[PDB]
Design a protein around this nucleic acid. Sequence first.
DNA 1: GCATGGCGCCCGAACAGGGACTG
DNA 2: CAGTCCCTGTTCGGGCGCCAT
Lengths: 554, 413
Amino acid sequence: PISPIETVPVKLKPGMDGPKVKQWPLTEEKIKALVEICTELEKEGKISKIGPENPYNTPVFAIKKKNSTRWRKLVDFRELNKRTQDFWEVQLGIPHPAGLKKKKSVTVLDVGDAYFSVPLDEDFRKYTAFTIPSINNETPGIRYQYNVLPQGWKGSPAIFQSSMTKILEPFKKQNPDIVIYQYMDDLYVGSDLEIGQHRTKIEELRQHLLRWGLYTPDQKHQKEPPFLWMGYELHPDKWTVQPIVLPEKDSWTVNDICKLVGKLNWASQIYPGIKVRQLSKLLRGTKALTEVIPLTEEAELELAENREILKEPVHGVYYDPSKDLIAEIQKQGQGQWTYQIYQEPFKNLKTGKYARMRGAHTNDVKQLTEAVQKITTESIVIWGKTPKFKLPIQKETWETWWTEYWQATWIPEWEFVNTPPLVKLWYQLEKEPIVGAETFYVDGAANRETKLGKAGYVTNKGRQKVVPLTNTTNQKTELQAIYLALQDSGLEVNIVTDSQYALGIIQAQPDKSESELVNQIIEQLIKKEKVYLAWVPAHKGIGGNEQVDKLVSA
Amino acid sequence: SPIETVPVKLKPGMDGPKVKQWPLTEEKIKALVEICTEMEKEGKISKIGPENPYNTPVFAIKKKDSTKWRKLVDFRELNKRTQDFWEVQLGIPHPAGLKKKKSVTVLDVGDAYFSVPLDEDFRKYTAFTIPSINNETPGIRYQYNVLPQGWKGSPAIFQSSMTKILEPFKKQNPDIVIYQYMDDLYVGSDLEIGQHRTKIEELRQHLLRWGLTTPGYELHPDKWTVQPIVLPEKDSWTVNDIQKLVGKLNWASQIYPGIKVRQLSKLLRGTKALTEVIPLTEEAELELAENREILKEPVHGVYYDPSKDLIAEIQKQGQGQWTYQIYQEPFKNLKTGKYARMRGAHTNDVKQLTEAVQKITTESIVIWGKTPKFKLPIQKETWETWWTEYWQATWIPEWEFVNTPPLVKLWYQ
DNA sequence: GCATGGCGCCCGAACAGGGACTG
DNA sequence: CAGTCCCTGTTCGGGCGCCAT
């Protein structure tokens, strides 16, 4: 059982000692289902009793497995982890079933009590001492050290995962033609072989582990479409997620909504169109998990429609390295994006969902750029290639973008899929001044101690309009001036301001916003058919701006 | 194979790298495994576990012409810590007149560092992980035994070795200077190109004698001339045009203290129309020429100082053209450069940017021998995604991200 | 006086840096 | 000018999802 592999040298963070925290009272039933576990372990050599010379103790509990029958011995080394060297994890992005290639025969096997078979570092066992009470708490019980790999240490999985790699290495060299997906103690095996040699190879692998101290109970796949791997259902040609059961209760709490959103996000994989922009809009605010909160009218709309899409039964498809890869994206709600990635016209590999506000004043193509780079840097992780795209955008819409923009951008091989809504840059500023338009000179100002301020403009034909301000900001005032010029002007306008800030946001030609004011400035911009906007020094001898600065006084 | 282990004195309290490893494509992923196995077999790199609290990322390059995947370690972070070592104790001198040549060539002396073996204590810090596709398996972990490819300390150690290796060529050619930086030689001569390119292939054999075979390209520092700021000239001067022209003429005020704009703005007094044409006066033309002449000689009162990092800033310009600057202190510029497109059929912002950076970096080394932090006119996300797919160099600079747009029709172009 | 690791989503707290105003 | 205030954008931590112990 123990001593097949080498022990990894672990040290305690320099300066510190070990854990000296008393064990807390436990449920009376758990203890009798725990002591029943500690003795079976000491029997196999996993644990060993000690003497009073060991001044270290660390709390322990227990919890039923995913079945409810067998339990799980968990220890709370939270005070140790703060004293154990900072390992570097070896586990990366979890594997994904849409990245799997079709193999004629496949089976998966699982190791029983895998943490309890890797020899723990020698001189470190002395800090894993837990003290178990008797039955009625009359006299102190037994106290053994975790002779084997613990269960709640600082980097417990890092050591196991690493050791598991070295043990499978030799078998990979002799058999570098078969597929092996080792995630923890769970590994997916399979190749384009045949029943005979396959099953022999399986026995060849079981016995390879068996000799390495890795006993695998008859709990391996039976070679049917019902394949439980990484919480899914791997059929021979199709694949679906873990039969998902959405929670439905009259009233909801902050916590109960969390347990839903994350459960909903998990279904974003195979299920297309699933969104939670609003459903989450309720998570805003420093809330406590138990706090009761009523669903919004828009939130009850999503949760009702999402409850129906999950009712619909769907399946994904497996990856083929010969065929081309195309990722089709489309826009959905305000700031919402859902995408389906496929290779066959109808068979999808994995659908997705992008919904973020990258900045205060974005844009639809600006969001689409990043909605592309999010699928790329996630398509590279599953497959080492960046796929082709089916974007809902006209080729002239994009060409005009990165030609009049300052921050460099770019998107790979894409086409134009005509599926509403089709993303478009609505308005557009003019590069050159317009003739026969009123030349609005706009500027604003605000006081730092009173917080009130005046914002206004003047023109060439003698046009003045300045108003007060309750609680505004110097930078905000300048923005207000620009707003005025868009209400008091025709379809053709000329505007000049002393603020880059002001200039900035418009220049970028934005669509959405989170300033209300700015979300409004665009409303006008969209309508005005020809607009031009120039800049000029603030406190300078410039003409026009000379007087409007004088007008926002006091 | 040679010598003994050189002791690397790292800064007290300072801890090593901890950069995570970023996903890679099958093209580079498959190119890297073997690359390591070969180094594993030849005992250049060992294999380690999670016991190691340190890391650094890795990726595969494929420079033009050659079809040999070079393995590059992003020691970008590790070097800043060992700066005491490869700057003070083991400093590689820089030849003042290296930049004053008619041609210099890039030599790839990478593999020449796998000779000397690394300190045992310091070996710990140089670890790296190689990711599996879709996490087929937990990324394997390795460590370095012999001098690394990229580290800036590799050639601070090899420095003793390398000078004796080039003893004959340098001693018998007093008109040919050389500069060693990271993993790339810098040989610059003065004579004709046909009688130069032959001196290179001849220098390749000298090194090939003691095990260096890695085929570079031409580049002449004399070709580089400064491009200040051009004040446009037109017949019809509209108010709009005088507006922008003062703006540009205002930025110039911070760089040149002799810039006058008063007289010029005096003709804009009073709220006037924008398209309305205005005729230039006598005192306005006495300044339009006064400014256009003062905008010739660089900013007096500015010198180079290695005591402060080097900073690079780039601004897109369009048509595929780009323009950049190189300064020590704000507005006290060192080189006012300009970049041209590689022509047509390659309409890509990212590729040109990565190219521009290398084409700037190169001139940083050559000229002074440092590397500038690039205020990059692109989004952290938009770059971290293809900054490799178009990279063809054995060095990685420090950088940051600027998002602020140009003001007055770009103060330069 | 109720555990670990990995990746993911979402969100407000903290930290950072650049431009414009002020005694 | 050194010191304040705004505004934006990036990075951190916390809880949940799922996988595994």
